[PDB]
Design a protein around this ligand. Structure first.
Ligand code: QYO
Length: 167
């Protein structure tokens, strides 16, 4: 039993809710919240900008030190950093950005990072400003992640479409 509430169950291990991931993180304080990161960990907008804003820019300060030491992430890769006031840990995962021409096949590699964590609160990778089809992203999630994932979908309209079209 865990503290996630109000989710619809899609599969054995995948759950979904219409929620603001920032507010969901603030209430649950999950072990892991996933950020929709880019390779530079520049948290300017989308999920990343909202998560970073909720940390009062502490996420960005920590991220800049990470990049200065380690260099950029790979598309499809991840790193574990602090969850600040939102979670124990933040798993920064880089899905491909269609608006930059990155290969959508890398979306499966991105979701594989979730399998290193038993339970996660996450957004749909490559959705929103990353330009992928969220229905495709949900399918890849279900077919790739084997650990327990709680998906927060900010837009109520998209949430309804994702549920109604789910196979
Ligand atoms: O909107 C759709 C497309 C992308 C996906 N993004 C999110 N998913 C879950 N929680 C989210 N909180 C946010 C706060 C923001 F300022 C911006 C985006 C998000 C956001 C859902």
């Amino acid at each position: 039993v865990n503290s996630f509430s109000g989710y619809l169950k899609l599969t054995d291990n995948v759950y979904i809710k219409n929620a603001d991931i920032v507010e969901e993180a603030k209430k649950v304080k999950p072990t892991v919240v996933v950020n929709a990161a880019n390779v530079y960990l520049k948290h300017g907008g989308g999920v990343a900008g909202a998560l970073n804003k909720a940390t009062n820019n502490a996420m960005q300060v920590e991220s800049d030190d990470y990049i200065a030491t380690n260099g950029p992430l790979k598309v499809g890769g991840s790193c574990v950093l602090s969850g600040h006031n939102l979670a124990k840990h933040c798993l920064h995962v880089v899905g491909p950005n269609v608006n930059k021409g990155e290969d959508i096949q890398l979306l499966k590699s991105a979701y594989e990072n979730f399998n290193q964590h038993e339970v996660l609160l996450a957004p749909l990778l490559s959705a929103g400003i990353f330009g992928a089809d969220p229905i495709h992203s949900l399918r890849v999630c279900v077919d790739t992640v084997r650990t327990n994932v709680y998906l927060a979908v900010f837009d109520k309209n998209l949430y309804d479409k994702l549920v109604s079209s789910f196979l």
